[PDB]
Amino acid sequence: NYEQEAQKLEEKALRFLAKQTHPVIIPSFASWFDISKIHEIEKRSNPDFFNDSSRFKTPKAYKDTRNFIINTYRLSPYEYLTITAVRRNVAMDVASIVKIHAFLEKWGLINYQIDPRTKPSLIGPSFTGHFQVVLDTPQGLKPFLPKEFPVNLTIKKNVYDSAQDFNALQDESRNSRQI
């Protein structure tokens, strides 16, 4: 019964999950940022979307636009993500698109240009444990049920020996006897 339900739910959630391939690097001062929340630094640097001045500028619109830009960059962090592509995909006034793009670029959240093959790797204090990033369940994948039904599934797992392995995104599976 519910066992098969959770099994199919895990199958579907894993099929439509974005598999990470390239590592993302951001400067340390951009550590206050969360993809699902808005920070005071974002409200100070963008007062027009929150002062309730216009109807075309709502916090929902700002958040949707910036999340689109963030996801688009993170999915292919080797390219540059020009403004014109975003403008062709997003439906805001060009001034707002430009302001959001410039703000995200200043804090290194997107288009942070490094050459990561010239720096060492360290270990932070928080380390050596099991870390479970718990993200909301997607709709359109929930089962069709024509009593409670909690769910705490686990989709995919990754193990790393050092921090350098974590940065290079190299799992023990293939790393063990690569050549």
């Binding site: 001045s53 390219e79 439906a91 060009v94 293939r174």
Partner: protein, 264 residues
């Protein structure tokens, strides 16, 4: 795990070549194993970026790409006690420009009430993206933008105070697909914006994201036009054709949106 194995970040840009190609149909600036999959975004490469080259598009980006220096805008030096916080002056802008052996057809919105960016800066950004930097092109773009700004400026800043309901026909062509729709719009209620309307339409019909701006933009256009006919008094209010059962505001009312691919 060696240092050398990592890849640099945010240097390449294959955008212009994606514009020029015909396999990638961009309506602007023209003249385990893999199934029916094009991009690796959902298929897990086994912790080896090399496999990313199994897809021709990623190979095209990594081969025909240029190194790009970043934009350096004015660091968002906002203003001193400016931006009087008017609602918005949202006017659409189109671009039909014939560069030497090249066409440029584009559209966007512009907030006339926001003096944060100037048309010259936008022209520079656009020309850098297209990789067609030339002062003549930027001057042409800026002059066109300024003309279209000066034309529709005063008309857009006219808030209607009496209930008007108009039958509207939207028709938008991307490159070869034509979107046609008819509905009844009220020019007084500031609740719904054309952007939300376009998003709902694109969600329901299951179109690409590229239709969200276009539709909305074209909608804005028509509104402004109607405003002209309502400033010059040439706009009547006695009737509006909506197929209502017998009184007004009933359950037939119109047809529905459709998207069709045409030729000739």
């Amino acid at each position: 795990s060696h240092q050398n194995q990592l890849i640099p970040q945010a240097y390449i840009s294959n955008f212009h070549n994606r514009l020029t190609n015909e396999d990638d149909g961009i309506p602007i600036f023209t003249m385990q194993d893999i199934g029916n999959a094009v991009l690796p975004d959902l298929q897990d490469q086994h912790h080896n970026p090399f496999n990313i080259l199994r897809y021709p598009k990623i190979r095209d980006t990594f081969i025909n790409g240029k190194v790009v220096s970043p934009y350096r805008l004015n660091t968002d030096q906002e203003t001193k006690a400016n931006a009087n916080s008017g609602e918005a002056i949202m006017i659409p802008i189109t671009l039909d420009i014939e560069h030497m052996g090249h066409t440029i057809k584009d559209q966007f919105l512009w907030n006339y009430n926001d003096d944060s960016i100037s048309p010259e800066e936008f022209a520079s950004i656009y020309c850098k993206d297209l990789d067609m930097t030339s002062a003549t092109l930027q001057t042409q773009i800026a002059n066109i933008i300024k003309e279209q700004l000066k034309d529709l400026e005063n008309i857009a800043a006219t808030e209607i105070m009496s209930d008007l309901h108009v039958i509207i026909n939207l028709t938008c062509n991307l490159q070869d697909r034509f979107f046609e729709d008819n509905f009844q719009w009220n020019l007084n209620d500031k609740s719904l914006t054309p952007e939300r309307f376009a998003t709902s339409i694109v969600q329901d019909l299951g179109l690409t994201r590229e239709f969200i701006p276009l539709i909305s933009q074209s909608l804005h256009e028509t509104i402004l036009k109607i405003k002209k006919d309502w400033v010059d008094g040439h706009l009547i209010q006695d009737h509006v054709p909506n197929d209502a059962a017998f009184d007004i505001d009933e359950l037939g009312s119109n047809w529905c949106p459709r998207v069709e691919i045409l030729t000739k």
